[PDB]
Amino acid sequence: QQYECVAEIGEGAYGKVFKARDLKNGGRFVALKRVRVPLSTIREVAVLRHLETFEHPNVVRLFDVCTKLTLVFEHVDQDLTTYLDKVPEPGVPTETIKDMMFQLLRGLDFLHSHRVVHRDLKPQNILVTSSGQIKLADFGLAVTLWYRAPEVLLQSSYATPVDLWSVGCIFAEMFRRKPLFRGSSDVDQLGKILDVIGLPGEEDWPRDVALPRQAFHSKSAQPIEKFVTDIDELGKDLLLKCLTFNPAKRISAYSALSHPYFQ
Numbered sequence: 001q002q003y004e005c006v007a008e009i010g011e012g013a014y015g016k017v018f019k020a021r022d023l024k025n026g027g028r029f030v031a032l033k034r035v036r037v038p039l040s041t042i043r044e045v046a047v048l049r050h051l052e053t054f055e056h057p058n059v060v061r062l063f064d065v066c067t068k069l070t071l072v073f074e075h076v077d078q079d080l081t082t083y084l085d086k087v088p089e090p091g092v093p094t095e096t097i098k099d100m101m102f103q104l105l106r107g108l109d110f111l112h113s114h115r116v117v118h119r120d121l122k123p124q125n126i127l128v129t130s131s132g133q134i135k136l137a138d139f140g141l142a143v144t145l146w147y148r149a150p151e152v153l154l155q156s157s158y159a160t161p162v163d164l165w166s167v168g169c170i171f172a173e174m175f176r177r178k179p180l181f182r183g184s185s186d187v188d189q190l191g192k193i194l195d196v197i198g199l200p201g202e203e204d205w206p207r208d209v210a211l212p213r214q215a216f217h218s219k220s221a222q223p224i225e226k227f228v229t230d231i232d233e234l235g236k237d238l239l240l241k242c243l244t245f246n247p248a249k250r251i252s253a254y255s256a257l258s259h260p261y262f263q
């Protein structure tokens with residue numbers, strides 16, 4: 001084979017990911033991934049090869065596609081979840097957050113501008129280069145609920161604001177170094193959320209969902225500076241807009257890039 005697997009670096013419902021040697025391209029480490037045995041896959045692959053034509057610095061580069069189906073990416077040495085583990089005390093520098101957040105919002109904005117929703121944005125998909133660059137992975141191709149948007153939990157909409165709620169949970173985890181909303185089910189996840197952001201208005205609750213608003217009793221909207229520590233006045237306003245219950249009122253990645261927090 002053109003690539004030689006050396007170690008497993010990821011497993012799940014997306015497929016099995018391997019660290020491999022690019023035997024033909026200088027022995028560089030690459031990320032292999034195999035998908036199962038269709039025409040909807042033809043669709044999602046052409047999109048992946050189309051976004052590659054742009055070669056965005058905040059998305060993992062696609063080196064090859066083979067034939068059930070093998071996907072070769074640029075190997076980046078570690079992910080966000082092992083970066084936050086190994087980072088020294090007392091945490092991530094305040095500007096290292098601001099920079100990584102901007103790279104995150106740029107990759108998401110690139111993905112959203114081309115009408116691609118990540119749908120599972122979490123630290124395990126966020127990768128950090130040895131240089132410190134944020135490169136997104138595991139998208140454009142079809143369990144932890146800790147980063148699901150409220151509208152995915154309620155099962156109503158699954159649009160681009162879904163990824164911006166996750167950005168809020170990652171934003172707060174870059175000050176906590178621990179997940180903000182950590183639930184054991186979708187009904188518990190939505191509860192741990194509303195316990196902090198507050199019970200929204202009756203018109204903010206989507207319709208035809210099985211879970212009614214009156215199901216929860218999270219009486220107050222709590223101040224976010226209690227659950228997240230060390231966030232500035234701007235880091236609060238930006239984080240509050242990502243963690244907005246109504247996806248229509250929630251901030252977009254394009255509007256988040258042009259926010260006072262990134263000056």
Ligand SMILES: C[C@@H]1CCCCn2ncc(-c3nc(Nc4ccc(N5CCN(C)CC5)cn4)ncc3F)c21
Pocket residue numbers: 008009010011014017031060073074075076077078079082124125127137138
């Ligand atoms: C498998 C990942 C992430 C999941 C989601 C699936 N997906 N998709 C792409 C990648 C990916 N990952 C890396 N590198 C990486 C990732 C994790 C790790 N890990 C090794 C095991 N450790 C316990 C944690 C760190 C090491 N290199 N480099 C390029 C990539 F395109 C991954």
